Amino acid sequence: NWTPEAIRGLVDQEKGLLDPRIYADQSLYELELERVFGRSWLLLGHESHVPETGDFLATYMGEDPVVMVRQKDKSIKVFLNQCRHRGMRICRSDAGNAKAFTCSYHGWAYDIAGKLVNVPFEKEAFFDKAEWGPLQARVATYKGLVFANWDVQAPDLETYLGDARPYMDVMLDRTPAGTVAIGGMQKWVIPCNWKFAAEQFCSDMYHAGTTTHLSGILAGIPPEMDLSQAQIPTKGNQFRAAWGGHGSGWYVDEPGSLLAVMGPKVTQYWTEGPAAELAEQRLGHTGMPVRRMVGQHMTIFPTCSFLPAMNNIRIWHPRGPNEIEVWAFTLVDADAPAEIKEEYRRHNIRNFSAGGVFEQDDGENWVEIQKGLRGYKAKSQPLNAQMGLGRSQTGHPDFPGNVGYVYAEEAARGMYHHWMRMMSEPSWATLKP
Amino acid sequence: NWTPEAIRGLVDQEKGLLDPRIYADQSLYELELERVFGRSWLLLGHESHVPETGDFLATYMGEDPVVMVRQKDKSIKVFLNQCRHRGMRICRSDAGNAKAFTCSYHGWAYDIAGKLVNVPFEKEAFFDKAEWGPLQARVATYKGLVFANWDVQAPDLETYLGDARPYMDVMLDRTPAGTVAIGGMQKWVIPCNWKFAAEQFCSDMYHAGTTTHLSGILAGIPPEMDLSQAQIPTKGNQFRAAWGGHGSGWYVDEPGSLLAVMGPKVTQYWTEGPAAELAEQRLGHTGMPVRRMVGQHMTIFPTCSFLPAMNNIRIWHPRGPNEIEVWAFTLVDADAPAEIKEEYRRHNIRNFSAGGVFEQDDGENWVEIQKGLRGYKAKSQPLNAQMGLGRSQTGHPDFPGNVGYVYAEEAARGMYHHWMRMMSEPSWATLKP
Amino acid sequence: NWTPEAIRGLVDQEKGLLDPRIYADQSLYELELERVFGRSWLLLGHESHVPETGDFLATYMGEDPVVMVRQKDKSIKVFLNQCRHRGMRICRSDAGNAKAFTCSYHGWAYDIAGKLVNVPFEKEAFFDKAEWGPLQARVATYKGLVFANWDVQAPDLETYLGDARPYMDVMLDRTPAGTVAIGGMQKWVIPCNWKFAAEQFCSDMYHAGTTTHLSGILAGIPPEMDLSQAQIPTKGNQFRAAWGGHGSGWYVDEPGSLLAVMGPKVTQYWTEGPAAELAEQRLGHTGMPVRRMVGQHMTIFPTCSFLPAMNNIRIWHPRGPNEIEVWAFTLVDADAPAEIKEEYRRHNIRNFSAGGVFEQDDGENWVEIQKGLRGYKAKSQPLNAQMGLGRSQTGHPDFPGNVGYVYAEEAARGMYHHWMRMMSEPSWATLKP
Amino acid sequence: PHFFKTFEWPSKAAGLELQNEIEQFYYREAQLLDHRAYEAWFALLDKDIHYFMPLRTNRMIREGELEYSGDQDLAHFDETHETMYGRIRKVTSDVGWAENPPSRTRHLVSNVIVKETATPDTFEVNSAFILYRNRLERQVDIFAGERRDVLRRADNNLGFSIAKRTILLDASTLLSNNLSMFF
Amino acid sequence: PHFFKTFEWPSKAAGLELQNEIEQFYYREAQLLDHRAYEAWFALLDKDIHYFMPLRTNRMIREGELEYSGDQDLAHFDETHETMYGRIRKVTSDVGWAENPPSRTRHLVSNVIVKETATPDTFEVNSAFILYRNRLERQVDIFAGERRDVLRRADNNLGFSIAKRTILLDASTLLSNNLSMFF
Amino acid sequence: PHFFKTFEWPSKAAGLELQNEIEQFYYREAQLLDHRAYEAWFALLDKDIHYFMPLRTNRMIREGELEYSGDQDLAHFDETHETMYGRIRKVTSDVGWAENPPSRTRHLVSNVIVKETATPDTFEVNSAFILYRNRLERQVDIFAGERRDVLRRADNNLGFSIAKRTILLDASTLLSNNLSMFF
Numbered sequence A, B, C: 001n002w003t004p005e006a007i008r009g010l011v012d013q014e015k016g017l018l019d020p021r022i023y024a025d026q027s028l029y030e031l032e033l034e035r036v037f038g039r040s041w042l043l044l045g046h047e048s049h050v051p052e053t054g055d056f057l058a059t060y061m062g063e064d065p066v067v068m069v070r071q072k073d074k075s076i077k078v079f080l081n082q083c084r085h086r087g088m089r090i091c092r093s094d095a096g097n098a099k100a101f102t103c104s105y106h107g108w109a110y111d112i113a114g115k116l117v118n119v120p121f122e123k124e125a126f127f128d129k130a131e132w133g134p135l136q137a138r139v140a141t142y143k144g145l146v147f148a149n150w151d152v153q154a155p156d157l158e159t160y161l162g163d164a165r166p167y168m169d170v171m172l173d174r175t176p177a178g179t180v181a182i183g184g185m186q187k188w189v190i191p192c193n194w195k196f197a198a199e200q201f202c203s204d205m206y207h208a209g210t211t212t213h214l215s216g217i218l219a220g221i222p223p224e225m226d227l228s229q230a231q232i233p234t235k236g237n238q239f240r241a242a243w244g245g246h247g248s249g250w251y252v253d254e255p256g257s258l259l260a261v262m263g264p265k266v267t268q269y270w271t272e273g274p275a276a277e278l279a280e281q282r283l284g285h286t287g288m289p290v291r292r293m294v295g296q297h298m299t300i301f302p303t304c305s306f307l308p309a310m311n312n313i314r315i316w317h318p319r320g321p322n323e324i325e326v327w328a329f330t331l332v333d334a335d336a337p338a339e340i341k342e343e344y345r346r347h348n349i350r351n352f353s354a355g356g357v358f359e360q361d362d363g364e365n366w367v368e369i370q371k372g373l374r375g376y377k378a379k380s381q382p383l384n385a386q387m388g389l390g391r392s393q394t395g396h397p398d399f400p401g402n403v404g405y406v407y408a409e410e411a412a413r414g415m416y417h418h419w420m421r422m423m424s425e426p427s428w429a430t431l432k433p
Numbered sequence D, E, F: 001p002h003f004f005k006t007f008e009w010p011s012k013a014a015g016l017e018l019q020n021e022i023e024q025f026y027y028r029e030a031q032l033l034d035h036r037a038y039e040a041w042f043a044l045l046d047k048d049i050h051y052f053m054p055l056r057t058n059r060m061i062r063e064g065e066l067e068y069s070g071d072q073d074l075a076h077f078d079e080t081h082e083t084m085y086g087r088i089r090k091v092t093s094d095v096g097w098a099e100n101p102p103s104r105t106r107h108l109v110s111n112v113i114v115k116e117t118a119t120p121d122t123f124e125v126n127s128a129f130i131l132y133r134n135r136l137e138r139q140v141d142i143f144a145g146e147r148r149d150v151l152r153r154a155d156n157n158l159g160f161s162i163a164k165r166t167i168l169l170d171a172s173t174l175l176s177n178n179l180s181m182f183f
């Protein structure tokens, strides 16, 4: 049994150590489903996935199937995809438009709000229908992005995100028209723990700066160039959130990282001219020189990761300690030229899908990692998260918050420390910021 | 450890609430193998599966493989299909005829009674062979059906069945000639808990009277007819056994779904003319108007389920909390005309095989229920088993026992209540009728 | 929790009784990885698998992936195949030659000794590299063979082996030139517990002298000969090691087994002429008339198994309670005529690969035993291990140690006994010889 | 050990043209099924179709005669033109839950062996298949087996009608929850 | 319950020489891929290749038009000659970790259905495949689907170039960790 | 990178008649194995048969030449006419437990590429297979690979004998507990 005391010693943000059991242990996993996924704000998608009355997306929150649906009044509701009669899936397609939801088992009927509104033979066989609809999550939107949380006593989304909002805004707050999701959402399965993924996007530019993406970079540079000519970016910064375990890292004034991935047309869009100027002007309140932020990774804890310049967005659905599903999609400015939208669509497919020249190599790592952790000794010694220890500060004249060097495990040490908190403190009264 | 107090909390027949954990929890399942399957009477097949000396069938009791074998003295023996030397499977084919069994591993030899009669190199390496033959099960027969029970302390079969016997007799006791199994036993695998299967056949006409079988009914009616012309019945009753988790439900006077499932030649055979009148006379001692019972489902707790007017029988073999095997066959009156037997055979394949126009939709439901239970919030609230609460009486003029309406969950509550009792009362002194 | 008291009662060598749970329990298995595999000497291969500096083999110790690499100083190092930064596999191919090993995730670099010698961005981001290399294992050699052990307080290899060494020498110490591994290491997967495999090679000549290999023999005998002519070897002996769980059994004087398995040229090389008399002379200090020992099996506990006259060698990698991997190779005397090496190669393929005429039938038994143990009653009573109980003597004129009859379970009882001891004695102070 | 087949002469080889036609027939048939063109696929079935898929069992070699269910036994399928029609009615129904949302299948056909019968333009055909069925989110069911058909030249789109089909599936216990697909 | 398909007459059957030529081309193409001859394979692809594998979703029958991703949507692949080139550079690279060590693939091709276009020596081809991928120690990924190609006669080794390829994969969620292979 | 294959001329295409003949030989061979006519199948083997299935391993690209086991190494099979005979004697044996009860297999054959050798009536053939093996209650073992045969025209029932066969399996570690089937 995992005591608060036992859980606190899985991480040590002082010495920079992690117990490898955190990624393999079944007991700890069941706890996460209650203590982490049960009460966290989890990303479900985007307002554009469900623009019209009755439009719906069937997605997950941990291992709980949920339906995200647009109401007549324009609000979004999120309710468990489970009939409380005998557990049947109420909504049985991936996405679409509904006037109602009917259970296929015994035909209990629901409206688009998840209210139980008809029970066949109710008169003859029966109880208050208004007390027997699917559990409802709280629904909260950040500039397009739809989040949801089961927990009534959890912090509101804005309070949850807190000072991470400027970094999300780099991607989400660049035009008066907002972003929109490009159609389609990719789904695939990697046999690894979710934390490898959520961390990597939280804190890890290191892998892209070293050996992991040597071949993906090669795929994006011109045919006349080989890897020895490649510009190795070393300039940039890393943000650890004040509360929540959120994290973002980015390159500064080194476009070669962004050029190879997203190509000249997008790299220009992001950094020079009307759009990029407008964006820096809109992000003025932050004082951030966003035209100089050329390649960024971010994670809103637990499982909302994205790559602000390439605008690849992803949810990690946990599937035990040993597996995840990755659900990916991509964002564009609603008023970006059709040229730039198309550049975003192509290059996201090229780099970040299941077949992508970057993605192939990220998941190759995580699979072998998870495989080693089946070993006894493989779990007996702690892992090294000591990169950039006590090097971050909130003074930074360019980027707000706890900021350090781009190769650092501070954002990681924060995420894991926040993971540990949620897993050892049962009451939101001690846990809230 | 699941305490008796905690197990007693899992089912509430007063309020009619079911804890979804019952279908998902690995620990409860391990306990089921001991407390339920280890001491219940379990269906193995029919006397006609093993008609002659030495005829055997390899089947299961829970997750224990067993051999059911016909003896020279015409009795039936049931032993564990496991060699007590190092555990090898003694009988290695599905069925057939044996003069003896011999273990493939080291050649321990058995007679057809499961008695160890030879150990190669006994004089050189040894021990009483009479003490080292495979574990024997108790064997008993109710009107052709072969049941077995490991537990020497359990109530005998007739006592265990109790007032459930009249409802079994509607199918099993219609002629002095008895029933016979059609040759062939179909086997398939469904990713769901056994209790969904057993509950449905026990109590759930509701799913057939509402949404699940709209398309199976559609497949059954005259090509010239459409669904809005089909007569889906509303009249009937549900039985809950005085003791033991047993239950049956049936339509009264409403042949529509019997006609659609079994066609006009079976429907007429079952309701009118010489054979039907004989059936009513034979069951005269029960007082039941069996000719007006047209479409019925039954379960003998835990895992013996059948459909009397259609004569489809199922054994649910449990394979963890998340899986079952379905072993299905069909029974006919041994003296039914060749024509009727053939309609029975034809229509059972059409409706109830793995490819059956009814069966496809039964399992479709269960697969999706079970996947959902992987979720934390999907197990966090009770399921509704409140249908027909308080509406059942014992003194019905036509049907014996505790009787209610056809769309009800009284039989369901009884089944889950007895499951609960079996799981929490370790001794037959308190558990027996 | 499994108390030491509970574990002690899982094996009874006095009565010769075994609790079947030992092969199925998930808790015991996890305990095994710690108490058995975490501190045993396990076979990794032969010295000839890594003849030159930098030569490596990626293999396992339990479920711990390890690298076995030849050093410049001609020693052999074995270290965990896991990077301590974030858990990545360091050596990603099966075998070959390395100048260094580099991790693909972030680029930490290692020499062929497993010392961490480079960290990308070490100055800008950081810690003693000499403390962040993968875990090293003790490495010791016995007459060609490479064993490894994580536990620094365990008995040295020679001590651990003890009086089992003469029986290993029958195979390993027949010429000054020593053995060599034929190229190639076959790998296959069996859904069974490792203990069935270890025990069989430890103690079970019985299966082969009875029913398992009737057809394997039939495959190998002259085409003009049927099984009734085939010879029934019954004459031979069996050795239980003084300490460790090791065991061997062999036929004396009866060469029908050997001839059918290995043919007439291997048979003659093993029993007649210059090489056979040299082998017997070399093992003179044992007193063993090795030319008369014709067909032999052996296990060095836990999972190092082999077959002296056919020179087939196996490592069993545990993969949970219900599965193993079989990694197999063959040994020949380094100076054996080309004719003989080739006969060894052919017949090892013919008999002992995954498609082997013997091996097909060994795994057939184990697959079914393991399936049966899913059953509750299948695990409810002990298995019989009473063969030759109280018949082995320690003063045999021909063979040293505790010696009984070829068909016995004395070595087997010893294997299970030492298994219980490792599982229930946390301290080498008590456990050591 | 010799077998009575030794006194039989090999059946005459189907010519290049007839071989290709029958192959193309099956590929077009598989297309229909994989694209869920059920009404169109049903049109290929002769009115006197016997569509049969016997149970298959584990038996010792000395009881090999008992491997498949018999004439008068249960089966996974044993269908006429009429009962197949109801099955088409169900699979194309908005309220047929097992196949709404529909599965995704692939019938990979090969090993086509053609025997001309004593009736011209009627053929006995033996082929092998793998049927890959993927359903909802993550469900994968893989089948393999052989089909033994009688095909007649017909005046339909594809040039052949299916007069008899038997499907011998390499399974005893069916590893799938249903057979909502057609073979 | 009839469909507009009923008013169309079936295409001209591909002749035997051409059927064989195109089968042989795919078999030799599968050999290229299964032997990891990636530069040789990339040489088959026309400069104007659009190589497209759309997403496939679970939809109710009455929303079947929505089953696959669209023209402007994300896809698993949506490639041009120039973007494929970068993929070849990655897969043949020493530091391409996903395929170094290389995976072990088999492309089993069948159901090849050929149509002559209005353009001589340009053909529309529909074929089915099972692609077996085996990786590292124990990983097995099996894919099934159909390929819709536009093939042109060409003076390369194999006699054809691939002008368009669309891969309709029998999956929604990909059960594999990646698509590090070519279809 | 350019490769030495660039200086080779493509092989002389097998004529349609020969293609069909060899494809039909493989289909009939598959049927024999799938129906367990082991003795009849054994009759297909030439007396000079070398039947070989090398080991296959994970190697970095730079050690590609070490992927498969060598001439003097262990293999999964490495058989002559005499040794195969013994295997036939075991599989047909009532006491051959691995195949009594027998398994249920499907040998799906495609991608048949035929090369005519210097010696007339001797052919090098490369084909692809999927082998689906189902055993007892619930065991399924799926193999994929290619076969490299040398076939000679013969006066047997099938018209060819198998003079050499090398099986290149898409596996490193065998995921099956045995290879009690033939390839």
Ligand code: FES
Pocket (backbone or CB within 6 Å): A083, A084, A085, A086, A087, A088, A103, A104, A105, A106, A107, A108
């Ligand atoms: S499960 Fe939804 S109505 Fe019964």
Ligand code: FES
Pocket (backbone or CB within 6 Å): B083, B084, B085, B086, B087, B088, B103, B104, B105, B106, B107, B108
């Ligand atoms: S296991 Fe049955 S004789 Fe040994």
Ligand code: FES
Pocket (backbone or CB within 6 Å): C083, C084, C085, C086, C087, C088, C103, C104, C105, C106, C107, C108
């Ligand atoms: S995992 Fe080895 S360097 Fe990061």
Ligand SMILES: [Fe+2]
Pocket (backbone or CB within 6 Å): A207, A208, A212, A213, A358, A362
């Ligand atoms: Fe990356």
Ligand SMILES: [Fe+2]
Pocket (backbone or CB within 6 Å): B207, B208, B212, B213, B358, B362
């Ligand atoms: Fe039903």
Ligand SMILES: [Fe+2]
Pocket (backbone or CB within 6 Å): C207, C208, C212, C213, C358, C362
């Ligand atoms: Fe053996």
